[PDB]
Amino acid sequence: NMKKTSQLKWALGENMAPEKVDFDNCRDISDLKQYDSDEPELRSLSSWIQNE
């Protein structure tokens, strides 16, 4: 078991989920909106996939 150090939690993503609070309270805050539901970013072919 690895000790828990700063860089390891950073890399492994610990303590980074937002807090769960009700709608009765954070109803008068700005920048409050849906989760993002957009199409992914488009990309084009490269050469390494055939070589692999």
Partner: protein, 434 residues
Amino acid sequence: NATEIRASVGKMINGIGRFYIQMCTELKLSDYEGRLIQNSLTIERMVLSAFDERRNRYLEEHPSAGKDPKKTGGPIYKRVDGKWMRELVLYDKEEIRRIWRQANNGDDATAGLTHMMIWHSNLNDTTYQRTRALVRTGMDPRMCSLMQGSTLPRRSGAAGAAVKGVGTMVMELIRMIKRGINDRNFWRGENGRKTRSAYERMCNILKGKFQTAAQRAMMDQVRESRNPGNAEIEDLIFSARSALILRGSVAHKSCLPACVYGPAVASGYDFEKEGYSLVGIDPFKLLQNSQVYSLIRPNENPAHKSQLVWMACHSAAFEDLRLLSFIRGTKVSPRGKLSTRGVQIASNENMDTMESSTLELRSRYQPAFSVQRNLPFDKSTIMAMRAEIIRMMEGAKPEEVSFRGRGVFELSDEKATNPVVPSFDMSNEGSYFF
């Protein structure tokens, strides 16, 4: 700048003295009470409860048991004709509001609030031993003379930095983060702003406290850490052993209670004209020339109770006896060596057997002639910037506590002309907590 500061200090002194005076006059007390430490402390308590917002809140909520809401009071003592009598009344608070007022030219006075409460706080220090507290936190025993501000209120924007000893801050931080373990919202919450604010100021001031280039960076790292945890904790505790080896810039100074401000005023003197130096000779003089009454139970030497009163009223922070007993004419005997149970009186035990007595509040008094002293040669226990702090520990000159404050020379030497070479008797122990 400094002159104006001293003037304001003297003004607050005058104010506290008036306050004591008015309170006394009203209660219908007499000279004796003016010099009755117990009643003085009761009044101080009362006023302190009074100026507290969080306190007000909680009380208004559901005060329940205790004195009536909006008012309060303390165990106040008074001989009848033969023996002392301990009463208790819930003085109305408006009275208190108006008494501070007149006493302070209508100017709020939290500065002296903290002065005197520091006073009572360090007094309680001379008297109690918070051994458990340490391990209660997990810190493990640290035989130290610091943590003077360990048992004081929250608001000392400055006084805290002045007296809170590295240990106090370290302990606080340990619990801080610690609650940042047991709790998750401390950061997982909008409260996060306030929370980080606190962590940060503390970091800065505590890192600055000591004077070791090495750890300083370590503390910077500890601060830059978000979502703190155990590693941070181990770090801090060692560094605190390392502080045991490094002076906490925090420097303790000196205290004066309303009881003493009171006759200082009732007697005759101009405080607002000349601010009493909490780090100079003025308070010393006033005290040496001030009467005082301490109620004492049986099986308690008057030389030992006066000694206990001395340290607490000299801001000793469990200081070294090598000078403590110098600075004062008589020999200062170790804590475990004195017959006393503190100053505060409980309600659980007999009151008829209360001998009142007069407190002996008087005192007789590295290229510099003063020789700082360290007695830390327990590298073994020290072992119990890794190599940096290790080597700095290996062969260096540490110090439990440096009372560079309180110039105390020869009391006839009023502004430090003839530093009398100190003569320390190495026979007796150096730490108040041994």
